[PDB]
């Protein structure tokens, strides 16, 4: 389909094969992969590339197939998850950096529109998460005060 | 024009606005026809003849169309009335009582090569001007 605010459709999907089982050619275990995930999380590595580094240097095809849990499921099980989802945090971080840039380049109207599109995505994520109880009902996305990196 | 199941309100609203673009429904609801025409929905009328004019016809055709100038008594509206038939101005003169009716032409408006005239005589002194034109009635001396 088209993108969120640009209508340029694309099909660069990551083709994951039909695997209903863990690997049969790998000796890795669930304890090994969960220990690797916890250690990489404590290093300071976000969940998007935790699985990537599992699949590249350890050749782990999928954490859900072996452990039975995704990365965020393991994070919630071990109390090693953030209080805010990573996508919302990334959008808010980019919006804060873009606002910091736009407070000195007031002619940069194109990036003002880019900031508006990212704000629309941020409000979409907040609406979905408050729909699904991930975030509090009264915590609205304030773009000036309640948008910090770790929100409390 | 929403085709969803629970979208009757949108279709009703868009039909409501699009209806006004028709001339007939909007002019009927707004009451322009009652407000405009001298008879006010009366099929015929009754006015005092004041002046007689043989108004000219259209550009391709060439003729003189006998058109009395009559002022209504029901409303005091001054208009022009076309008197049809051979010897049309012979049976009508100044200061008469003549029934008048619409000419019944294009869109209820002026008919044929008569410019600016929408009303026609149908009877002089409450007797049929058609029969006077034919020759089965005689003009009263009143």
């Amino acid at each position: 389909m088209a993108k969120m605010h640009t209508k340029r459709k694309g099909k660069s999907s990551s083709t994951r094969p039909i695997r209903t089982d863990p690997p049969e050619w790998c000796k890795i275990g669930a304890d090994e992969v969960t220990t690797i995930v916890l250690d990489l999380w404590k290093q300071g590595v976000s969940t998007a590339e935790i699985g990537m580094v599992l699949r590249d240097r350890y050749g782990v095809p999928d954490a859900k197939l072996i452990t039975g849990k995704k990365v965020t499921t393991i994070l919630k099980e071990n109390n090693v998850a953030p209080n805010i989802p990573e996508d919302l945090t990334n959008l808010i971080v980019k919006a804060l950096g873009l606002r910091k840039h736009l407070s000195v380049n007031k002619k940069d109207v194109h990036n003002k529109r880019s900031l508006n599109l990212t704000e629309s995505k941020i409000r979409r994520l907040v609406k979905y998460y408050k729909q699904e109880k991930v975030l509090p009902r009264d915590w609205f996305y304030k773009p000036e005060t309640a948008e910090m990196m770790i929100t409390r | 024009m929403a085709k969803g199941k629970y979208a009757a309100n949108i279709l009703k609203q868009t039909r409501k606005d699009a209806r006004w673009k028709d001339t007939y429904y909007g002019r009927r609801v707004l009451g322009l026809n009652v407000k405009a025409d001298p008879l006010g929905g009366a099929p015929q009328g009754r006015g005092i003849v004041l002046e007689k004019v043989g108004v000219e016809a259209k550009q391709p055709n060439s003729a003189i169309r006998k058109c009395v100038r009559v002022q209504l008594i029901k409303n005091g509206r001054q208009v022009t009335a076309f008197c049809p038939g051979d010897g049309a101005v012979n049976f009508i003169d100044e200061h008469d009582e003549v029934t008048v009716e619409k000419i019944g032409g294009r869109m209820g408006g002026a008919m044929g090569d008569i410019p600016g005239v929408r009303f026609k005589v149908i009877a002089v002194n409450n007797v049929s001007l058609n029969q006077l034109v034919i020759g089965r009635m005689e003009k009263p001396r009143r």
């Binding site: 389909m1 039909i18 | 085709k3 969803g4 199941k5």
Partner: protein, 129 residues
């Protein structure tokens, strides 16, 4: 965004019939899609259909035996009773006892002839002929 899979499947069947292709694939399969395909198969208008799962919603490899003329969804899915089928039949269908309307009912999904036999109505689903 994909928001009418039954109508998409019937439009694909319409396209495949119009080109005269014997076989065609059905984009993501659904249970109501399978019920419509089974009732259409019992009507004889459609030959064969198999759910080939793909780690997704699933698709169909439908063998069109060349028996239909056009088939799309019924939008909106109108509520219909046992005494309310003939007006929809006169609207969508071309002739009496010619083509059937796919109906969804609490008993089951089926053409409106068998629904009238059941004496139970519901929502119109589609039409095929």
């Amino acid at each position: 965004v994909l928001l009418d899979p039954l109508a998409n499947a019937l439009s694909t069947i319409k396209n495949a019939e119009a080109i005269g292709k014997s076989s065609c694939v059905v984009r993501p399969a659904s249970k109501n899609i399978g019920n419509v395909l089974k009732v259409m198969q019992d009507l004889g208008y459609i030959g064969d259909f198999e759910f080939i799962d793909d780690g997704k919603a699933g698709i169909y490899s439908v063998t069109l035996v060349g028996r239909i003329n056009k088939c799309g969804a019924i939008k909106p899915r109108y509520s219909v009773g046992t005494a309310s089928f003939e007006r929809w039949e006169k609207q969508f269908l071309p002739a009496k006892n010619f083509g059937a309307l796919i109906v969804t009912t609490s008993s089951g999904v089926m053409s409106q002839y068998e629904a009238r036999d059941k004496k139970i109505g519901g929502q119109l689903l589609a039409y095929v002929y």
